[PDB]
Amino acid sequence: KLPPRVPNLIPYVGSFVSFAKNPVQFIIDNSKKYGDVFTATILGKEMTFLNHPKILDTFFKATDNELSLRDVYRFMRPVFGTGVVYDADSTERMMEQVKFVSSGLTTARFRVFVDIFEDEIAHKVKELGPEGTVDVAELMADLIIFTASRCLLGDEVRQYLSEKNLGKLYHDIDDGISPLSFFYPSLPAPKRDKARKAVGEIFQELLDKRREEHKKHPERLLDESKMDVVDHLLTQKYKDGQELTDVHRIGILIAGLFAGQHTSSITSSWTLMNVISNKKVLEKVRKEQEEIMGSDKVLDYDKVMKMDYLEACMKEALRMYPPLIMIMRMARKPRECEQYIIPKGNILVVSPSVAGRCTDTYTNPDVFDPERLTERKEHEKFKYGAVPFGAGRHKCIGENFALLQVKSIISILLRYFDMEYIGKIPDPSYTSLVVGPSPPTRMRYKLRKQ
Numbered sequence: 001k002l003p004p005r006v007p008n009l010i011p012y013v014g015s016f017v018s019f020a021k022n023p024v025q026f027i028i029d030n031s032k033k034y035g036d037v038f039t040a041t042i043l044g045k046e047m048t049f050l051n052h053p054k055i056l057d058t059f060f061k062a063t064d065n066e067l068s069l070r071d072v073y074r075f076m077r078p079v080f081g082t083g084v085v086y087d088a089d090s091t092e093r094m095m096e097q098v099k100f101v102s103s104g105l106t107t108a109r110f111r112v113f114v115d116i117f118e119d120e121i122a123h124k125v126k127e128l129g130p131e132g133t134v135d136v137a138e139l140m141a142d143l144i145i146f147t148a149s150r151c152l153l154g155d156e157v158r159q160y161l162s163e164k165n166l167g168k169l170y171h172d173i174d175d176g177i178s179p180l181s182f183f184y185p186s187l188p189a190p191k192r193d194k195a196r197k198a199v200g201e202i203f204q205e206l207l208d209k210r211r212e213e214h215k216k217h218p219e220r221l222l223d224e225s226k227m228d229v230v231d232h233l234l235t236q237k238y239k240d241g242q243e244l245t246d247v248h249r250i251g252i253l254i255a256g257l258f259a260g261q262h263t264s265s266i267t268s269s270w271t272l273m274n275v276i277s278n279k280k281v282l283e284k285v286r287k288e289q290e291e292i293m294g295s296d297k298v299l300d301y302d303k304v305m306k307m308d309y310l311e312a313c314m315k316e317a318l319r320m321y322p323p324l325i326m327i328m329r330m331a332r333k334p335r336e337c338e339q340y341i342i343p344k345g346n347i348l349v350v351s352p353s354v355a356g357r358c359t360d361t362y363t364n365p366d367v368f369d370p371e372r373l374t375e376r377k378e379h380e381k382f383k384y385g386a387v388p389f390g391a392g393r394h395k396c397i398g399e400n401f402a403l404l405q406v407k408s409i410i411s412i413l414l415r416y417f418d419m420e421y422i423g424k425i426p427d428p429s430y431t432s433l434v435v436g437p438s439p440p441t442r443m444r445y446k447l448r449k450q
């Protein structure tokens with residue numbers, strides 16, 4: 001019947017301490033001890049970890065009344081908002097809301113986004129000067145905040161960033177959600193709530209402003225390259241004809257931005273760091289750039305679409321250091337897994353971090369080798385060998401945008417600068433919801449064109 005248990009340190013708390021010490025190592029260690037499927041008590045929750053590629057289809061192809069997302073990620077309600085996303089009234093409503101974000105992520109917008117990336121980096125180079133050292137994680141977070149905001153919200157957001165502290169407000173929301181929220185969703189967090197209200201009022205203002213501009217300039221509606229997520233949200237209704245409330249519009253923008261930022265800034269950090277620290281890798285990347293750029297001096301979309309090796313580097317950083325280390329679902333009915341049955345109420349857990357280091361799937365997995373993908377094709381062994389964007393019904397809809405954003409940023413930065421990373425590549429720090437490199441992450445740079 002039930003899978004093998006990790007014996008608990010204590011009653012209730014169970015395996016929390018070793019889990020909290022390092023959840024990826026926790027799953028590796030215990031998979032060796034107990035197999036492909038084991039269960040653990042963790043601050044009251046029964047958590048069943050699925051750890052081999054071969055068993056993942058049952059997880060990924062379930063429906064939302066078999067394996068529920070809304071039951072596990074509903075603690076995000078104070079960040080994204082009441083009635084939005086995991087706190088939507090239904091699974092169907094949640095799916096429609098996700099479609100509004102995805103509808104500002106079209107090819108047409110992607111061509112405009114490349115120019116945004118060029119513009120923001122040009123502004124950033126003036127702060128950095130011709131030489132120096134900079135924290136990599138912060139540079140990326142700072143660039144991704146301006147770029148993602150303008151990509152999703154339109155250029156009207158830029159004054160609020162540069163003259164109303166919106167970047168700091170985001171960091172206060174990010175500040176007040178920890179992994180413990182998953183276990184205790186009512187842990188009060190008053191600075192987070194203060195910042196969420198502030199961003200709320202700014203986004204309300206942005207919606208009102210946009211309404212005026214849709215009156216005075218209705219042609220924008222026709223032009224697909226100027227239509228951002230704010231615009232769709234103001235002009236689309238739910239499928240059954242119910243109109244959106246501004247509360248929901250606001251929440252959906254906050255959520256989209258939350259997805260738009262942290263995961264990409266972290267991936268960019270890991271990618272850049274490993275690129276510039278491996279001489280061979282850096283040579284191949286620069287040889288592709290020079291071939292694709294030719295005599296042009298700025299990026300455009302079709303150039304970014306030919307950056308295959310740089311794409312493979314990003315993918316390799318996502319194998320090794322996926323920012324979303326664990327994917328979860330609650331069993332609403334018992335579930336068959338292998339010989340076992342997982343019972344109603346257990347949380348199923350799949351980890352892209354664990355998959356990424358599986359010795360089945362990958363050889364020398366602690367080595368950053370983009371050619372493992374580009375030649376040895378190691379990812380395609382199993383159907384679910386690589387899942388840093390998930391799989392199936394709830395696969396990331398931001399994937400192409402993230403690829404575009406991180407390739408572009410790293411390509412532009414390489415065009416401007418020679419860069420050298422200081423010290424050894426860090427380990428992941430398992431202290432936030434979205435997992436990034438352990439500080440410090442510093443690099444030297446110098447401008448290539450005096």
Ligand code: HEM
Nearest residue numbers: 259260263264267324327388389390394395396397398402
């Ligand atoms: C490198 C950057 C990113 C990574 C690693 C990533 C990873 C993921 C993963 C693993 C999932 C599956 C979660 C699950 O099944 O429970 C997912 C879902 C999602 N991602 Fe991303 N993501 C990234 C960027 C983005 C961006 C830039 C956006 C939007 C701007 C976005 C929007 C979403 C949405 C809306 C879903 C939900 C899909 C659904 O449930 O239908 N993501 N992402």
Ligand SMILES: O=C(O[C@H](Cn1ccnc1)c1ccc(F)cc1)c1cc(Cl)cc(Cl)c1
Nearest residue numbers: 073076085098101255256258259263396433
């Ligand atoms: O930000 C979004 O999800 C991120 C995890 N994430 C980050 C990037 N891609 C996925 C997320 C999810 C659950 C958490 F508990 C914490 C963070 C998100 C999800 C949906 Cl369904 C809709 C929208 Cl608009 C945003």
